[PDB]
Amino acid sequence: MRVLLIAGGVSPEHEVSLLSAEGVLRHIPFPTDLAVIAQDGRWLLGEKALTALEAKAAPEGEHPFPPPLSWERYDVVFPLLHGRFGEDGTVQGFLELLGKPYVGAGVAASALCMDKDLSKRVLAQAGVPVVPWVAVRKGEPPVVPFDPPFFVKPANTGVGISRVERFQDLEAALALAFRYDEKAVVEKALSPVRELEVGVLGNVFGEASPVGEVRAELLIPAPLDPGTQETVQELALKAYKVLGVRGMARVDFFLAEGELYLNELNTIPGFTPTSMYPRLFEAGGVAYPELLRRLVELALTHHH
Amino acid sequence: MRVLLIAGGVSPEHEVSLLSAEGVLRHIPFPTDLAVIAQDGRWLLGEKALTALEAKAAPEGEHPFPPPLSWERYDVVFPLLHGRFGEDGTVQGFLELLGKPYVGAGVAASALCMDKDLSKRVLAQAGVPVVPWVAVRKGEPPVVPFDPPFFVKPANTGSSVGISRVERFQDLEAALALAFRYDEKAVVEKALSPVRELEVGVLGNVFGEASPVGEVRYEAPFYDYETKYTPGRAELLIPAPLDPGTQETVQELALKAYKVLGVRGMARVDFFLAEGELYLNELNTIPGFTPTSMYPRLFEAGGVAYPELLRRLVELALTHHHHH
Ligand SMILES: Nc1ncnc2c1ncn2[C@@H]1O[C@H](COP(=O)(O)OP(=O)(O)O)[C@@H](O)[C@H]1O
Ligand SMILES: [K+]
Ligand SMILES: [Mg+2]
């Protein structure tokens, strides 16, 4: 079985995407070719991709989309792209039309988990705790029922984020966010707050890894009481199932005043050997080569 | 200025899509080329695409995806595909990576509006009244929180394909198996009867304008496939016979759901009216443009002639891409 690895991308996470590709290529137990999307959207195949990998940045590519890629020569595609044109369902839709099995969530789950507003609406309706938030659309004035501090983020970008401490500064933060997305979210900023992260693996019905914490060091496992550790994993699996995520997801939480809040589901998390998602499943008995093998196997299982 | 019209698809609504292409091609006020996705997934271009149209069905195609199209010839793509692979964000995602302006909703809104489970979760959270429902996975034991009669559907479907009305729990397993033939996730809704079916068209990007409210009448048990497209079988009341407050409320809820889901271009929003209570049934981001179709007739009743509706759909696509 041969695997195609697509990395880079036009998003600001182009570099960290290439760093994830280097770690995967160094440990995947399959023959794996690399294909790079340069920052200008054009593709690099063959040796120019590896050259772009070693340079850690591909500013300009060769082939405009769609690329002259021998799709039939690969059994599984691993979209290792972060952010826009990576985790938002566009590349997934292309692969769906190519008929190629691919790692990770499908079009609907990728687009939903990328939308900071619509994902919370789904999660809140399912009974999953999330931080109080409001959507603001460009032009329409904002209606914020809570008090500062807020976070003002572009809803679909995954840059333009501001921590607003005075209501006076809200119009400036919305103006900054609106130049990257027509819809913005305003989230109540919790403080003090701890960040917890847990990995899920599987198709719709996943298994949870141990919980980790970001304090920038990675506490693995996170120093959590037995009850809180369980609720984090339970809440992650529920959210994973409600959104219909496939393959994998890193589910980030907030812990404040003893309350858990689902922060974000990442369908293509950072994947260096030292990244949180591989380290969490390593702590759970799933080593990095085995983790990559299972992700490929799950891509084929869904494809029947 | 040149529009590429894409019709057909590998969804069950393939033949419905070719009918809509004929209606759009007849009145579109732009130079428009047709491309057809045959039922095997392979594309027909140029003269073969037009021949596939007169056949009213395209079983086999020539070019595998992606097709050898000169995308730089076309300023706007009009995906006139219904259902899976066309209305659910997959084709939209391809057009996004191509950098080409296209008519209709984006990736997220298309995928969300094609999922009868997730869409209702968003609408119910935003306070939009919906029918009580439950989702069921393939091979997962069904737990129906209410009592029959039911409507069992695949979560991703169109033109009433795979939908069953259930009156006994013994008939539920057979209704779910029929639904699982078209989707791995099913929905089980509480059947409303008697029910009136109200439909209203929306036009615009996120902040839309509503058409007059129309109504669907028929003698069949429900608005099924044969009723929807066999001419004369379903009768369209345009505008619908309603109180002023009722037509107003339908339009307000249509625009509200349209805005929450971030729909672009167009949508036909369908409602249930039962015992004085309204219920939003579903949103359709690529509605029909065929002779028995409600969307263009509603805007025609509202003063927007068929060529003008298609002109604004194309211009809205250009506005979003180049200016947002
Ligand atoms: N809860 C319900 N109560 C009454 N009729 C229903 C209900 N759900 C579906 N129907 C009937 O089934 C038809 C199609 O349902 P819908 O959810 O729109 O599926 P599709 O998207 O395939 O059209 C509707 O026109 C309606 O007549
Ligand atoms: K729909
Ligand atoms: Mg439908």
XYZ file of C-alpha atoms and ligand atoms in Angstrom:
657
model
C 0.000 0.000 0.000
C 1.329 3.400 -1.080
C 0.242 6.631 0.620
C 0.213 10.204 -0.702
C 1.065 12.946 1.804
C -0.183 16.461 0.999
C 1.306 19.238 3.123
C 2.060 22.945 3.164
C -0.970 24.919 2.055
C -1.841 28.567 1.482
C -2.958 29.095 5.089
C -0.665 30.892 7.563
C 0.026 27.409 8.986
C 2.024 26.472 5.867
C 5.245 26.025 7.856
C 3.831 23.996 10.755
C 2.158 21.825 8.107
C 5.552 21.060 6.559
C 6.954 20.292 10.015
C 4.090 17.824 10.485
C 4.922 16.192 7.144
C 8.568 15.739 8.149
C 7.538 13.905 11.312
C 5.039 11.688 9.494
C 7.493 10.811 6.716
C 10.098 9.913 9.358
C 7.809 7.327 10.984
C 4.991 6.176 8.675
C 5.224 2.394 8.142
C 4.203 2.674 4.480
C 5.786 3.816 1.222
C 4.794 7.474 1.154
C 5.257 10.178 -1.473
C 5.058 13.857 -0.550
C 3.120 16.510 -2.462
C 3.442 20.152 -1.405
C 0.977 22.989 -1.896
C 3.066 26.140 -2.103
C 1.958 29.377 -0.463
C 0.796 30.631 -3.885
C -1.546 27.645 -4.275
C 0.500 25.852 -6.933
C 1.679 22.297 -6.357
C 5.120 20.694 -6.153
C 5.455 16.992 -6.971
C 8.359 14.564 -7.051
C 11.698 15.924 -5.878
C 10.673 19.594 -5.682
C 8.317 18.698 -2.821
C 11.112 17.120 -0.770
C 13.271 20.127 -1.652
C 10.440 22.343 -0.410
C 10.267 20.154 2.703
C 13.954 20.597 3.552
C 13.635 24.348 2.953
C 10.721 24.315 5.478
C 8.832 26.761 3.220
C 7.520 26.569 -0.358
C 6.696 30.148 -1.430
C 6.046 29.315 -5.100
C 4.843 26.134 -6.781
C 4.897 24.671 -10.272
C 1.507 23.150 -11.132
C -1.824 24.980 -10.843
C -4.723 23.108 -9.301
C -5.703 20.487 -10.238
C -2.191 19.003 -10.369
C -1.004 16.350 -12.864
C -0.808 13.779 -10.080
C -0.852 10.015 -10.643
C -3.784 9.562 -8.273
C -4.252 5.933 -9.344
C -0.789 5.112 -7.939
C -1.806 5.726 -4.305
C -4.146 3.756 -2.059
C -4.676 6.422 0.628
C -4.322 10.212 0.664
C -3.287 11.886 3.929
C -4.345 15.559 3.798
C -1.824 17.001 6.265
C -2.998 20.577 5.725
C -4.025 22.948 8.519
C -6.581 25.732 8.443
C -8.235 27.145 5.343
C -8.046 24.905 2.263
C -6.952 22.116 4.604
C -9.377 21.332 7.430
C -12.434 23.110 5.986
C -13.672 20.371 3.633
C -12.480 21.784 0.300
C -9.604 19.333 -0.204
C -11.809 16.577 1.216
C -14.434 17.335 -1.432
C -11.797 17.160 -4.164
C -10.646 13.761 -2.881
C -14.268 12.588 -2.657
C -14.672 13.436 -6.343
C -11.343 11.732 -7.085
C -12.669 8.591 -5.404
C -9.529 8.298 -3.287
C -9.798 7.095 0.324
C -8.361 9.732 2.624
C -7.425 10.218 6.265
C -9.575 12.360 8.521
C -13.031 13.851 8.667
C -15.274 14.186 5.637
C -16.594 17.325 3.993
C -19.438 18.046 6.416
C -17.525 17.366 9.635
C -14.454 19.247 8.377
C -16.495 22.317 7.437
C -18.541 22.227 10.647
C -15.583 21.832 13.026
C -13.847 24.688 11.186
C -16.807 27.025 11.836
C -16.427 28.445 15.345
C -20.055 29.595 15.392
C -21.975 26.712 13.811
C -20.000 24.044 15.683
C -20.915 25.602 19.032
C -24.584 25.772 18.015
C -24.481 22.035 17.283
C -22.594 21.280 20.500
C -24.756 23.491 22.723
C -27.877 21.840 21.293
C -26.396 18.424 22.158
C -25.814 19.518 25.761
C -22.032 19.933 25.484
C -20.738 22.893 27.529
C -19.142 25.726 25.556
C -18.072 29.219 26.582
C -20.751 31.913 26.157
C -20.430 33.393 22.691
C -22.181 35.477 20.043
C -21.833 35.600 16.269
C -21.365 39.004 14.632
C -21.785 39.418 10.880
C -20.072 42.193 8.940
C -22.211 45.324 9.003
C -24.758 44.083 11.509
C -23.925 45.678 14.873
C -22.845 43.325 17.670
C -25.139 42.284 20.516
C -22.895 41.073 23.356
C -24.854 40.140 26.522
C -21.783 39.492 28.701
C -18.924 41.710 29.884
C -15.212 41.903 29.000
C -12.735 40.346 28.667
C -13.751 38.775 25.342
C -11.986 37.035 22.523
C -12.931 38.325 19.063
C -12.043 35.798 16.372
C -12.772 35.312 12.684
C -15.283 32.483 12.718
C -13.909 30.394 9.824
C -10.235 31.377 9.438
C -8.228 29.478 12.058
C -4.798 35.525 12.701
C -7.187 38.423 13.260
C -7.855 37.309 16.848
C -7.955 39.913 19.622
C -8.389 39.770 23.389
C -10.737 42.664 24.157
C -10.474 44.092 27.674
C -12.774 47.131 27.261
C -16.132 47.244 25.470
C -14.759 50.463 23.946
C -12.296 48.375 21.901
C -14.871 45.934 20.475
C -15.496 47.820 17.220
C -11.759 47.819 16.483
C -11.489 44.078 17.136
C -14.493 43.338 14.918
C -12.954 45.517 12.202
C -9.715 43.531 12.470
C -11.492 40.167 12.375
C -13.767 41.124 9.469
C -10.825 41.580 7.085
C -10.290 37.792 7.202
C -13.902 36.526 7.415
C -17.368 38.023 6.991
C -18.572 36.362 10.221
C -16.930 36.775 13.622
C -17.424 35.235 17.056
C -17.127 37.004 20.405
C -16.314 34.541 23.197
C -16.283 35.218 26.930
C -12.653 35.022 28.033
C -12.217 32.763 31.060
C -9.521 33.630 33.602
C -7.858 31.964 35.329
C -8.156 29.026 32.915
C -6.382 25.765 32.108
C -6.178 24.224 28.630
C -6.869 20.497 28.308
C -6.547 18.482 25.106
C -7.562 14.909 24.293
C -7.183 12.851 21.137
C -9.889 10.734 19.529
C -9.270 7.936 17.019
C -11.805 5.988 14.967
C -14.760 6.422 12.638
C -17.722 8.177 14.325
C -17.389 5.800 17.309
C -13.896 6.678 18.497
C -11.574 5.896 21.388
C -10.195 8.615 23.648
C -6.527 9.069 24.507
C -5.256 10.219 27.898
C -5.846 13.896 28.604
C -2.997 16.370 28.221
C -2.563 19.959 29.358
C -0.876 23.045 27.917
C 0.747 25.202 30.599
C 4.877 26.128 26.681
C 5.116 22.574 28.037
C 2.887 19.548 27.397
C 1.804 17.866 30.638
C 1.079 14.257 29.665
C -0.970 13.037 31.321
C -2.632 16.210 32.572
C -2.693 16.537 36.383
C -6.446 15.980 36.701
C -8.624 14.414 39.366
C -10.236 11.107 38.308
C -13.691 12.612 37.788
C -12.531 15.504 35.608
C -10.315 13.230 33.498
C -13.326 11.030 32.715
C -15.712 13.877 31.862
C -13.196 15.347 29.400
C -12.929 12.033 27.548
C -16.694 11.457 27.677
C -17.411 14.957 26.357
C -14.855 14.501 23.572
C -16.395 11.229 22.369
C -19.906 12.701 22.442
C -18.867 15.761 20.430
C -16.891 13.529 18.056
C -20.011 11.432 17.444
C -22.488 14.330 17.220
C -20.412 16.065 14.536
C -19.804 12.785 12.690
C -16.016 13.127 12.695
C -14.029 10.396 10.936
C -10.460 9.241 11.413
C -9.151 11.562 14.112
C -9.612 14.795 16.046
C -7.845 16.637 18.845
C -10.576 18.023 21.097
C -9.464 21.072 23.097
C -11.175 22.065 26.350
C -11.105 24.868 28.903
C -11.114 24.272 32.664
C -12.189 27.198 34.841
C -13.750 27.210 38.321
C -14.135 23.446 37.984
C -16.216 23.765 34.802
C -15.338 22.162 31.472
C -15.949 23.965 28.180
C -15.415 22.463 24.750
C -13.100 24.909 22.963
C -12.378 23.438 19.526
C -12.220 20.176 17.575
C -9.169 19.955 15.295
C -9.683 17.428 12.503
C -6.083 17.790 11.265
C -4.039 18.503 14.420
C -0.327 19.160 14.506
C 1.438 15.889 13.806
C 5.112 16.247 14.680
C 6.376 13.485 17.006
C 6.389 16.110 19.784
C 2.895 17.392 18.951
C 0.084 16.892 21.444
C -2.040 14.427 19.464
C 0.705 11.830 18.746
C 2.129 12.214 22.258
C -1.303 11.644 23.814
C -1.905 8.356 21.990
C 1.684 7.337 22.705
C 0.853 7.729 26.398
C -2.236 5.607 25.693
C -0.240 2.734 24.200
C -0.496 3.746 20.525
C 2.994 4.510 19.248
C 3.557 7.016 16.443
C 4.101 4.386 13.689
C 1.060 2.452 14.914
C -1.002 5.650 15.132
C -0.253 6.465 11.492
C -1.029 2.893 10.428
C -4.436 2.993 12.140
C -5.314 6.321 10.509
C -4.563 4.806 7.096
C -6.499 1.633 7.943
C -9.502 3.701 9.057
C -9.465 5.615 5.762
C -9.781 2.328 3.866
C -12.452 0.913 6.190
C -14.784 3.866 5.589
C -14.270 3.547 1.820
C -15.488 -0.097 2.186
C -18.908 36.860 -19.692
C -19.676 33.142 -19.865
C -21.391 30.725 -17.468
C -20.544 27.033 -17.168
C -23.680 25.077 -16.251
C -23.082 21.685 -14.611
C -25.975 19.220 -14.479
C -26.594 15.529 -13.895
C -24.634 13.972 -11.046
C -24.289 10.537 -9.486
C -27.030 11.275 -6.931
C -30.520 9.758 -7.257
C -31.699 13.225 -8.411
C -29.644 12.894 -11.613
C -32.636 13.065 -13.968
C -34.204 15.910 -11.974
C -30.948 17.832 -12.439
C -31.017 17.490 -16.235
C -34.589 18.808 -16.247
C -33.471 21.879 -14.288
C -30.638 22.498 -16.760
C -33.184 22.691 -19.584
C -35.203 25.277 -17.668
C -32.126 27.321 -16.774
C -30.609 27.087 -20.263
C -33.885 28.317 -21.775
C -33.966 31.651 -19.929
C -30.425 32.342 -18.688
C -29.347 35.762 -20.046
C -25.665 34.852 -20.388
C -23.676 32.797 -22.889
C -23.789 29.414 -21.191
C -21.995 26.129 -21.868
C -23.261 22.840 -20.449
C -21.236 20.066 -18.836
C -22.899 16.855 -17.656
C -21.778 14.451 -14.938
C -22.996 11.028 -16.020
C -24.311 8.501 -13.514
C -20.933 6.715 -13.523
C -19.208 9.923 -12.389
C -17.594 10.606 -15.769
C -18.100 13.929 -17.518
C -19.619 14.804 -20.885
C -18.512 18.059 -22.508
C -19.436 20.119 -25.540
C -21.857 18.592 -28.012
C -22.095 15.271 -26.157
C -23.375 17.146 -23.097
C -26.214 18.695 -25.116
C -27.064 15.292 -26.598
C -27.215 13.872 -23.066
C -29.751 16.598 -22.254
C -32.241 15.602 -24.966
C -31.899 12.007 -23.735
C -33.151 13.171 -20.291
C -30.643 10.684 -18.788
C -26.842 10.277 -19.036
C -25.847 6.746 -17.958
C -22.198 6.754 -19.062
C -19.662 9.557 -19.384
C -16.415 10.058 -21.279
C -13.934 12.067 -19.189
C -13.049 10.968 -15.639
C -12.813 13.553 -12.892
C -11.286 16.039 -13.076
C -12.465 16.752 -16.629
C -10.303 18.474 -19.282
C -12.249 21.736 -19.063
C -10.832 25.153 -19.929
C -11.969 26.738 -16.667
C -10.406 30.077 -17.679
C -13.127 30.417 -20.336
C -15.858 30.621 -17.687
C -16.438 33.495 -15.267
C -19.118 31.749 -13.166
C -19.855 28.070 -12.569
C -23.510 27.163 -12.005
C -23.637 23.820 -10.142
C -27.174 22.631 -10.914
C -26.639 19.282 -9.182
C -29.105 17.999 -6.585
C -28.287 15.796 -3.610
C -25.056 13.982 -2.851
C -22.007 15.220 -4.791
C -23.317 18.617 -5.812
C -25.547 20.028 -3.084
C -23.559 18.833 -0.038
C -20.364 20.884 -0.437
C -18.176 18.373 -2.294
C -18.475 20.007 -5.725
C -18.363 23.408 -4.016
C -15.046 22.528 -2.378
C -13.586 21.626 -5.768
C -14.766 24.956 -7.188
C -13.190 26.704 -4.190
C -9.785 25.137 -4.877
C -10.208 26.130 -8.535
C -10.709 29.753 -7.475
C -13.811 30.034 -9.648
C -16.928 31.984 -8.628
C -19.951 29.716 -8.415
C -23.693 30.019 -7.813
C -25.224 28.883 -4.544
C -24.177 28.140 -0.998
C -20.613 27.544 0.127
C -19.063 24.340 1.408
C -20.274 24.556 5.013
C -23.824 25.711 4.254
C -24.286 23.109 1.509
C -23.073 20.262 3.727
C -25.138 21.501 6.675
C -28.358 21.955 4.677
C -27.985 18.511 3.072
C -27.803 16.872 6.529
C -31.322 16.592 7.959
C -29.876 15.903 11.435
C -27.190 18.571 11.870
C -29.286 21.258 10.162
C -32.126 20.735 12.638
C -29.663 20.925 15.538
C -28.521 24.367 14.357
C -32.052 25.592 13.638
C -33.403 24.339 16.976
C -30.518 26.021 18.808
C -31.269 29.295 16.997
C -34.898 29.015 18.133
C -36.356 27.992 14.762
C -39.278 25.576 15.313
C -38.643 22.099 13.907
C -40.381 18.734 14.133
C -39.204 16.493 17.010
C -36.662 14.092 15.544
C -33.887 11.642 16.376
C -30.817 10.451 14.480
C -29.949 6.775 13.990
C -26.637 5.338 12.783
C -26.259 2.297 10.548
C -26.170 -0.863 12.636
C -27.039 1.162 15.750
C -30.176 0.189 17.711
C -32.849 2.866 17.214
C -34.144 4.716 20.278
C -37.213 6.698 19.167
C -38.166 9.170 21.937
C -41.741 9.456 20.605
C -44.583 7.340 19.181
C -45.691 6.687 15.569
C -46.601 7.839 12.969
C -43.012 8.500 11.834
C -41.200 9.779 8.791
C -37.945 7.856 8.294
C -35.371 9.448 5.998
C -31.718 9.176 5.070
C -29.922 12.150 6.587
C -28.564 13.137 3.149
C -31.191 12.806 0.419
C -33.446 14.757 -1.911
C -36.629 14.428 -3.952
C -38.126 12.188 -1.216
C -35.742 9.345 -2.124
C -35.667 6.623 0.524
C -38.296 8.234 2.781
C -40.919 6.098 4.530
C -43.990 6.984 6.570
C -44.198 4.529 9.474
C -47.243 3.641 11.576
C -45.892 0.703 13.622
C -42.563 0.002 15.307
C -42.465 -3.346 13.493
C -42.232 -1.332 10.257
C -39.392 0.839 11.590
C -36.558 -1.628 10.950
C -37.639 -1.961 7.311
C -37.944 1.822 7.029
C -34.440 2.278 8.448
C -32.947 -0.348 6.128
C -34.433 1.497 3.149
C -32.927 4.731 4.483
C -29.523 3.119 5.088
C -29.355 2.261 1.377
C -28.711 5.970 0.705
C -26.929 7.189 3.866
C -25.119 5.791 6.890
C -27.182 8.079 9.164
C -30.976 8.236 9.323
C -33.520 10.543 10.938
C -36.805 9.547 12.564
C -39.255 12.453 12.698
C -42.692 12.789 14.250
C -45.188 12.653 11.394
C -47.613 15.580 11.217
C -51.068 14.867 9.783
C -52.978 16.733 8.574
C -50.117 18.946 7.358
C -49.905 21.801 4.868
C -46.612 22.272 3.025
C -45.440 25.864 2.552
C -42.423 26.793 0.425
C -40.696 30.160 0.049
C -37.693 31.108 -2.057
C -34.789 33.220 -0.818
C -32.293 35.193 -2.918
C -29.115 36.929 -1.781
C -25.867 36.423 0.107
C -26.467 35.668 3.815
C -28.919 38.592 4.058
C -31.578 37.463 1.604
C -34.937 38.659 0.343
C -37.962 36.375 0.478
C -40.316 35.527 -2.363
C -44.066 35.172 -1.842
C -44.996 32.061 0.112
C -46.315 29.182 -1.982
C -48.154 25.993 -1.079
C -48.002 22.408 -2.347
C -51.185 20.340 -2.666
C -51.623 16.709 -3.695
C -53.741 13.612 -3.107
C -50.875 11.189 -2.386
C -50.073 10.350 1.263
C -47.029 12.640 1.120
C -45.021 14.778 -1.308
C -43.113 11.818 -2.787
C -40.933 11.527 -5.897
C -43.706 10.729 -8.386
C -45.854 13.539 -6.977
C -43.028 16.090 -7.142
C -42.206 15.666 -10.837
C -45.124 13.991 -12.624
C -46.903 17.028 -14.132
C -50.422 17.669 -12.877
C -50.025 15.334 -9.891
C -48.890 18.103 -7.516
C -50.675 21.457 -7.607
C -48.859 24.666 -6.663
C -50.818 27.425 -4.914
C -48.939 30.658 -5.643
C -49.262 32.658 -3.553
C -50.450 30.408 -0.734
C -53.833 31.138 0.889
C -52.643 32.377 4.295
C -53.299 35.017 6.917
C -50.974 38.037 6.670
C -49.245 37.127 9.930
C -48.646 33.596 8.654
C -47.054 34.602 5.346
C -44.991 37.164 7.263
C -43.800 34.600 9.820
C -42.805 32.074 7.138
C -40.708 34.726 5.397
C -39.084 35.862 8.655
C -38.155 32.308 9.653
C -36.840 31.608 6.152
C -34.511 34.619 6.258
C -33.471 33.814 9.837
C -32.508 30.215 9.038
C -30.904 31.452 5.806
C -28.758 33.886 7.795
C -27.795 31.549 10.656
C -26.568 28.907 8.192
C -24.752 31.514 6.080
C -26.454 30.516 2.832
C -25.313 32.329 -0.308
C -27.027 32.785 -3.642
C -30.337 31.021 -3.145
C -32.407 28.510 -1.212
C -35.960 27.244 -1.221
C -36.990 26.946 2.429
C -39.808 24.463 3.051
C -42.200 24.620 6.004
C -44.883 22.501 7.628
C -48.123 24.130 8.774
C -50.066 22.011 11.259
C -52.728 22.907 13.836
C -51.712 26.562 13.613
C -48.047 25.815 14.388
C -45.234 26.343 11.891
C -42.292 23.977 11.430
C -39.265 24.477 9.186
C -38.890 21.213 7.266
C -35.663 21.749 5.308
C -33.596 24.134 3.214
C -32.664 23.283 -0.379
C -29.629 25.175 -1.662
C -29.959 23.888 -5.241
C -33.754 23.866 -5.737
C -35.409 22.630 -8.885
C -35.710 24.781 -11.986
C -37.846 22.218 -13.851
C -41.437 22.717 -15.091
C -42.983 21.378 -11.868
C -40.586 23.409 -9.697
C -41.649 26.038 -7.157
C -38.590 28.295 -6.839
C -38.634 30.281 -10.126
C -42.440 30.462 -10.185
C -42.476 32.007 -6.699
C -40.050 34.793 -7.620
C -41.939 35.332 -10.877
C -45.040 35.880 -8.740
C -42.970 38.320 -6.674
C -41.899 40.392 -9.685
C -38.590 38.661 -10.491
C -38.871 37.200 -13.984
C -37.058 33.964 -14.831
C -34.129 35.605 -16.709
C -33.739 38.248 -13.990
C -33.569 35.609 -11.245
C -30.808 33.807 -13.142
C -29.040 37.120 -13.778
C -28.952 37.980 -10.066
C -27.826 34.470 -9.109
C -24.831 34.892 -11.422
C -24.096 38.426 -10.204
C -24.320 37.389 -6.546
C -21.708 34.718 -7.277
C -19.370 37.320 -8.787
C -19.932 39.760 -5.914
C -19.011 37.248 -3.202
C -15.853 35.942 -4.869
C -14.278 39.217 -5.992
C -15.539 41.462 -3.159
C -17.026 39.416 -0.255
N -42.466 15.238 9.950
C -43.194 15.190 8.808
N -44.535 15.367 8.815
C -45.263 15.319 7.684
N -44.738 15.093 6.466
C -43.405 14.895 6.309
C -42.543 14.937 7.502
N -41.286 14.718 7.077
C -41.334 14.550 5.732
N -42.593 14.656 5.274
C -42.990 14.528 3.852
O -41.863 14.056 3.108
C -41.509 14.993 2.086
C -39.997 15.117 1.953
O -39.379 15.375 3.213
P -37.958 16.134 3.229
O -37.414 16.139 4.640
O -38.123 17.418 2.452
O -37.105 15.120 2.311
P -36.417 15.603 0.935
O -35.293 16.509 1.378
O -35.954 14.318 0.291
O -37.528 16.307 0.191
C -42.142 16.313 2.482
O -42.559 17.055 1.333
C -43.326 15.913 3.333
O -44.492 15.847 2.509
K -31.783 19.797 1.627
Mg -34.337 17.963 0.511
